[PDB]
Design a protein around this ligand. Structure first.
Ligand SMILES: OC[C@H]1NC[C@H](O)[C@@H](O)[C@@H]1O
Ligand SMILES: [Ca+2]
Length: 769
């Protein structure tokens, strides 16, 4: 490996061998079918709301999130990089697809598949990833850096449906070597969204953009139809000429044949026929190819950029609504702009790389932080792009000031912006894209007084309940299978209109977003104030026994939606205390004296009773009335965690908080599989896991990172990082369960999981407040 030093991969990149088998992989631990796409994953490509494409560590374009809100794992075999090399003085060269696998059927049988093991590495530090190719039969070593311009405080390039592939090639040998790199791509119009005739009308064209000191050559893969539908648009691949390289192309090869129409050309001398052909297809799948060819002398290096774009301007949800995607603001809505997007990337990728370096540098250059922590911090962000992210620029056939946004809870539980989860998972948005975060919160503010008296069947017990009650914050802003932003509360396992955490979490999120954006946005506080007061006043009505605290009803009436709470719980009770303190402060800022006094009075009463009811001398009891009310809950002081972040001071005595956190570390972490797997949710005082519900026996990745944050800002530094390390280990390490780029909600002690690709572990960014 002499290519590593010609490129700059950070030491904190996650790494794996190309073609590496992983033996320890976890699987779902639930009864009903659950997504399990295997451990063959990678960092995704694509901006926010663009649809993303997961290219795996084996090189395949395999995890397709282009249909917004859906996860489709299938390798499109035509989509590849391939290499040809010939040593000067030899009769024949060698050609190889850079994919550690082969097709399942006979399509593309002529291509050279099965890139060998032990011949290259994959590296990832989101939004960047890299492949190195160090193969004994390829004298010239290659590497590629691939990325999309995901940039904090940037709402433009961050939205783009584009990826850059910056290749580096180096000849360490003493002979001249002829080298070609070829990008192939299937015309994927009709891959989703088209009910019949899926390839019909697909056609490919070549664009040659020649200016001074510039040549880009690109294939545009589209359809003859000008229909404005979800399935229609264009894909483009292309390359920018650099000194010392020639470009060749093939506009049309058949993907549903043996591939030899293309491969016979490439495998001979690495040079394609330059045959244009715009003839549309009927049944056959078609693709395009763009190649570069160059000669490397001994010791010579060359860099060449390729790119990929996709202009699919319309997203459609299962309820019928069609929206334009955010990037259309910048490139247009007609679905004929893939070349413009590609050209922007090819002409500006060097600036984008520097912008990414500029935002990663503060963390990467802090040598007090271990590299494993940096691996997790950056790579967990894959979810902001990969979480079915929807970001609208208008409803089809209708202009407003804002662009509504939503991130899925996950794909198995297909709900946008689940609020009890975003309480944990929204940290990267407030920290790094605060204009999105505030937009999401204003969306919630607007729903507070919505009433929908239609009824749904509650899944957990079969009872009928009202869909949306006035004054109760919704669980979610809909499902991609139905109508995101329009039909809220798609969740039906429990009735969220009686949850005891949603209204308080809402208030806490509002105040968080003011505090973490500099305490300057009074306008955001003004927009949300009525909803905040309404939320607290409605939750106060759920105090059945006049202790000043909402009562859990002996059912799962909060985020732990199979774990029953009864009476005053540490979790919902501490959230309530913190939300009251936050509202007091907002009242002061907005000069609403009567709100300040009222919430101050509720706070003093609730605080005294919480302490009396739950403090046991060592920690806060789980609750006041449950069968295992003395269980040690990992999240028992969630309200105090948030109060620390919001700078609201002590809601509970410092001594008791410290005692409680030390107990959690000593028990829920250290007596759970040696502290190597995170904090288990519930532990009995005798040091064995609480078995009253599956959720008590689970480690929640997002809860655990949040607890690590809580510990860190309370000065328990070793405990904080040791607690977080188990999550990192299980997710990324060789000794883990193979969850890289699909961090789940939960695992049990056997390491098996529930709900891969989950929003909650984005809470790791609360460790960087
Ligand atoms: O895993 C628990 C999780 N299930 C799915 C629900 O949408 C969410 O509110 C809850 O926290
Ligand atoms: Ca009460």
């Amino acid at each position: 490996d002499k290519i590593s030093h010609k490129i700059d991969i950070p030491d904190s990149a996650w790494t794996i061998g190309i073609g590496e088998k992983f033996k320890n992989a976890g699987h779902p631990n639930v009864k009903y079918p659950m997504i399990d796409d295997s451990y063959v994953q990678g960092a995704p490509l694509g901006g926010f709301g663009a649809g993303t494409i997961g290219r795996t560590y084996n090189g395949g374009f395999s995890r397709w999130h282009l249909e917004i809100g859906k996860n489709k794992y299938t390798t499109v075999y035509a989509n590849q990089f391939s290499v040809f090399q010939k040593v000067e003085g030899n009769k024949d060269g060698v050609a190889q697809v850079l994919y550690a696998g082969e097709p399942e059927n006979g399509y593309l049988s002529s291509w050279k598949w099965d890139y060998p093991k032990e011949s290259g590495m994959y590296y990832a530090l989101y939004p960047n990833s890299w492949y190195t190719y160090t193969n004994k039969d390829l004298p010239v070593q290659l590497a590629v850096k691939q990325f999309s311009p995901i940039i904090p405080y940037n709402y433009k390039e961050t939205s783009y449906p584009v990826a850059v592939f910056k290749w580096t090639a180096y000849n360490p040998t003493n002979k001249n070597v002829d080298v070609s790199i070829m990008f192939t791509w299937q015309n994927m119009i009709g891959f989703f969204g088209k009910q019949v005739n899926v390839n019909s009308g697909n056609f490919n064209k070549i664009i040659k953009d020649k200016s001074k000191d510039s040549e880009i050559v690109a294939a545009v893969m589209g359809n003859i139809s000008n229909d404005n539908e979800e399935w229609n648009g264009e894909y483009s691949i292309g390359v920018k000429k650099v000194p010392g390289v020639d470009i060749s192309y093939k506009a049309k090869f058949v993907t549903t044949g043996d591939g030899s129409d293309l491969w016979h050309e490439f495998s001979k001398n690495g040079i394609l026929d330059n045959k244009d052909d715009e003839t549309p297809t009927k049944q056959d799948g078609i693709g395009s190819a763009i190649a570069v060819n160059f000669k490397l002398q001994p010791g010579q290096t060359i860099e060449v950029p390729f790119a990929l774009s996709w202009d699919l301007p319309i997203m459609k949800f299962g309820g019928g609504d069609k929206w334009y995607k955010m990037y259309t603001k910048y490139f247009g809505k007609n679905g004929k702009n893939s070349f413009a997007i590609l050209k922007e990337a090819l002409n500006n990728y060097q600036k984008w790389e520097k912008m990414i370096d500029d935002w990663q540098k503060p963390i990467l250059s802090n040598k007090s932080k271990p590299d494993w922590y940096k691996t997790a911090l950056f790579n967990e962000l894959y979810y902001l792009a990969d979480g079915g992210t929807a970001w609208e620029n208008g409803k089809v056939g209708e202009k407003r000031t804002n662009n509504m946004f939503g991130l899925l809870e996950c794909f198995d539980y297909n709900y946008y912006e689940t609020l009890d989860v975003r309480f944990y998972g929204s940290f990267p948005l407030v920290m790094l894209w605060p204009d999105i975060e505030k937009q999401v919160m204003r969306q919630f503010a607007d729903t507070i007084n919505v009433q929908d008296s239609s009824e749904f069947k509650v899944g957990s017990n079969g009872a009928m309940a009202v869909k949306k009650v006035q004054g109760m914050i919704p669980h979610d802003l809909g499902s991609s299978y139905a109508l995101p932003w329009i039909k809220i509360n798609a969740y039906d396992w429990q009735n969220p209109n009686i949850w005891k955490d949603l209204n308080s979490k809402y208030v806490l999120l509002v105040y968080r977003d003011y505090v973490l954006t500099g305490k300057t946005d009074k306008e955001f506080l003004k927009y949300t104030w009525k909803s905040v007061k309404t939320a607290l006043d409605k939750l106060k009505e759920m105090d059945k026994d006049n202790d000043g605290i909402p009562d859990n009803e002996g059912i799962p009436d909060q985020t732990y939606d199979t774990w029953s709470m009864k009476g005053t719980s540490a979790y919902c009770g501490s959230l309530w205390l913190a939300a009251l303190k936050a509202a007091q402060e907002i009242g002061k800022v907005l000069k609403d004296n009567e709100a300040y006094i009222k919430y101050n009075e509720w706070y003093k009463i609730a605080q005294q009773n919480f302490e009396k009811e739950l403090w046991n001398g060592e920690y806060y009891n789980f609750d006041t009335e449950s069968d295992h009310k003395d269980s040690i809950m990992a999240d028992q002081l969630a309200g105090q965690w948030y109060a620390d972040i919001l700078r609201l001071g002590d809601i509970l005595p410092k001594d008791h908080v410290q005692k409680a956190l030390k107990k959690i570390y000593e028990f829920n972490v250290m007596k759970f599989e040696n502290g190597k797997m995170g904090a288990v949710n519930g532990m009995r005082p005798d040091g064995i896991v609480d078995e009253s519900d599956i959720q008590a026996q689970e480690v929640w990745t997002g809860v655990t990172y949040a607890l690590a944050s809580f510990m860190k800002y309370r000065g328990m530094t070793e405990e904080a990082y040791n607690t977080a390390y188990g999550v990192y280990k299980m997710t990324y390490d060789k000794s883990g369960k193979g969850y890289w780029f699909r961090t789940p909600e939960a695992w049990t002690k056997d390491g098996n999981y529930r709900a891969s690709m989950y929003m909650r572990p984005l809470s790791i960014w609360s460790m960087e407040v």
